[PDB]
Structure 1
């Protein structure tokens, strides 16, 4: 599990980022690296928590994101030439070409 912030290029200027928690199951381990901007497709879920209710005084629920796919978006912002999680991967026919 990992802590996810807001991209500095997407946040409105002069504001504060928003934090969330991302959970990675098998085969997703160590795919992401610290400091690397990423894009995660996942499932939104909520669960009960004690001290969150204790300090807020209302039945509020914590939320986490169970990741399903990760795509790296560091540097190469051009994201319209082709589709897929990894644009640097080739098929067999592309290798033949």
Structure 2
């Protein structure tokens, strides 16, 4: 909605002049860090966002999807005023969003978690190699740019298309924390951009990713019912913790 644009006008205020620990804006120093490192992940603490207002924190537990797209463009605006450049560097920065309890583990998940950002934790299992995803579409003409997708692609040209690395990692629940007489159920995890390669098999990993379904997907043969797949599109990655 257009009203949500006004929200941006607020969150930018949270993005720069917000201070903590006696002056010295933290998020200003993060933008300065990348910044110099130019690693294109801007990192916003949930603790602080929730500290300023609970209304946005509530938006993170309701509808993270379109709000991150609203938010990171503004982050790009803040980097734009701080470093009048990076029109040539990545032109997108998607925010990492540190710890968000919740702190649902694995095996405890329901429909109520759909479309809403949720923290998960557990051991990594062997990960697929890095296969560039289509993302943005562009050509010399010759229709215009078509974003597809996460993850459908319905309903190919290519000239210069901006690829972004994809990686799918299967996250299994930690063996120590398993309640007796229960098998360690596990979920699919979709990394994107820089989150790629941060993971290694054998390790416990803390992920903030949102939960997703689509699209049946494929069973319809052995289920009996219209049952969707369960795939956590990932947001951040941290060692345990």
TM-score, length of structure 1 as denominator length: 0.70
C-alpha deviation, 1:53, in angstroms: 2.1
Q: Secondary structure, in 3 states, of the residue corresponding to 1:21?
A: strand
Aligned length: 74
Q: CA RMSD in A?
A: 1.4
Looking at both structures, which has the greater relative contact order when contacts are Cα pairs under 8 Å and sequence separation is at least 6?
1
C-alpha deviation, 1:50, in angstroms: 4.7
Higher fraction of strand: 1
Q: Secondary structure, in 3 states, of the residue corresponding to 1:9?
A: helix
Mark the structure with the bigger radius of gyration. Answer: 2
Counterparts of 1:55 and 1:45, CA distance in 2: 21
Higher fraction of helix: 2
Q: Secondary structure, in 3 states, of the residue corresponding to 2:234?
A: strand
Counterparts of 1:9 and 1:26, CA distance in 2: 31
Q: Secondary structure, in 3 states, of the residue corresponding to 2:180?
A: coil
Alignment of 1:52-67 (within 5 A): 52-67=219-234
C-alpha deviation, 1:49, in angstroms: 2.1
Please list every run of 5 or more consecutive structure 1 residues that lacks an aligned counterpart in the other structure. 74-78, 80-97
Deviations 1:35-65 (A, max 9, x none): 0011110110111225422110100000100
C-alpha deviation, 1:22, in angstroms: 0.3
Select the residue among 201, 204, 218 that pairs with 1:34. Answer: 201
- Report the equivalent of 1:19: 186
Deviations 1:61-89 (A, max 9, x none): 0010011011101xxxxx5xxxxxxxxxx
TM-score, length of structure 2 as denominator length: 0.29
- Report the equivalent of 1:49: 216
Judged with a 3 Å threshold, the aligned counterparts in structure 2 of structure 1 residues 42 and 50 are, in CA distance, closer, same or farther, namely closer
Q: Secondary structure, in 3 states, of the residue corresponding to 2:176?
A: coil
Q: Which runs of 4+ in 1 moved over 2 A?
A: none
